[PDB]
Design a protein around this ligand. Structure first.
Ligand SMILES: CC1=C(/C=C/C(C)=C/C=C/C(C)=C/C=C/C=C(C)/C=C/C=C(C)/C=C/C2=C(C)C(=O)CCC2(C)C)C(C)(C)CCC1=O
Length: 320
């Protein structure tokens, strides 16, 4: 009947932005030097219309030792470390970076971007010439919508460093968890077409960084699938993902539809936008949420999708 694997397929008319993994695959064909140059140029152009937020103090304490090593290196040595990261080389810095959470790696590169601008780290060489393929990948990124662009950039960062699979057993380094926003101060979401209390609780608890309440919405074996990734299965792993990767999001759902399927279960699709704390309101990612709920309104499965275009925000099929 329903398994996690079959639940992945609900609302199959939902068109996701698979140009993100497509573009990443093209990017991964390029030399390390062209990868760095390409991201430099893309980030420079993006900055003209989107506004990145500075990393917090606790984010940066974990990257500090590595950044100070870099601050001291020659321009040549600095470039070599950056190429090592892009190449996923086996070096001490690449092994250190492999155990950092997503947001720590992002803060590392945001500091390097500042330093490269303002003189401290080796710039991209003046008159650098991208390969023909790299020039085309950069143009492809320019034509993506902002939500797709920042997803490509983040993925490129997350994939650098030594393969964490190749490390064995290892302590993942992550920020302290923010406290749940006071109940009184929360702003509840509204969703046109949906009043299911679990769906509203999922949105509101995530918006409040209240992961202990969020996780109780799931079945013990319930799964969550982030954009372009495999399902994270079971409360233990979902709860860790929440606390590690999901703080300070702003979910802005707009509309949804609900459909009874077999055995008192119910499949629900919501569309809307999401803001990441890295860009705030300057980037609104067009998202769908696809939930499979038990008769007791528990989340058996939820998939979160980055949508191919804004048209898909209105794609809400009520009968299958
Ligand atoms: C690297 C590099 C550079 C620098 C580059 C830099 C500094 C790049 C920086 C890039 C940054 C900061 C990108 C951040 C992206 C964040 C995203 C896509 C978050 C999405 C979250 C979502 C969708 C969450 C959704 C969620 C919802 C709704 C749920 O319902 C459930 C949870 C879930 C998580 C699934 C240089 C400029 C120096 C050039 C050299 C070079 O290589």
């Amino acid at each position: 009947p329903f398994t996690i694997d079959s639940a992945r397929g609900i609302f199959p008319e939902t068109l996701t932005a698979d140009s993100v993994p497509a573009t990443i695959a093209r990017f991964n064909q390029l030399s390390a030097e062209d990868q760095l140059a390409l991201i430099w140029f893309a980030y420079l152009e993006m900055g003209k219309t989107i506004t990145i937020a500075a990393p917090g103090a606790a984010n940066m304490v974990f990257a500090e030792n590595t950044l100070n090593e870099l601050k001291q290196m020659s321009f040549q040595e600095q470039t070599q470390v950056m190429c090592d990261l892009a190449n996923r080389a086996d070096t001490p810095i690449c092994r250190t970076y492999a155990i950092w959470s997503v947001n720590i790696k992002l803060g590392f590169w945001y500091r390097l971007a500042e330093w490269m601008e303002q003189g401290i780290v080796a710039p991209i060489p003046q008159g650098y010439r991208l390969s023909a393929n790299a020039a085309a990948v950069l143009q492809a990124i320019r034509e993506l919508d902002a939500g797709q662009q920042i997803t490509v950039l983040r993925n490129s960062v997350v994939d650098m460093g030594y393969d964490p699979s190749k490390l064995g057993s290892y302590t993942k380094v992550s920020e302290p968890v923010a406290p749940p926003k006071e109940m009184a101060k929360r702003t509840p979401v509204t969703i046109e077409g949906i009043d299911n209390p679990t769906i509203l609780s999922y949105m509101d608890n995530l918006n409040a960084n209240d992961f202990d309440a969020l996780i109780e919405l799931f079945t013990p074996d319930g799964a969550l699938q982030p954009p372009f990734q495999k399902p994270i299965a079971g409360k233990e792993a979902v709860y860790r993902f929440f606390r590690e990767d999901c703080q300070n999001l702003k979910l802005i759902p707009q509309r949804g539809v609900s459909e009874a399927v077999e055995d008192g279960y119910t499949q629900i699709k919501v569309t809307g936008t999401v803001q990441t704390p890295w860009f705030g309101a300057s980037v609104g990612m067009n998202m769908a949420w696809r939930f499979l709920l038990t008769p007791e309104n528990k989340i058996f499965f939820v998939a979160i999708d980055l949508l191919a275009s804004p048209k898909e925000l209105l794609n809400l099929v009520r009968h299958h």
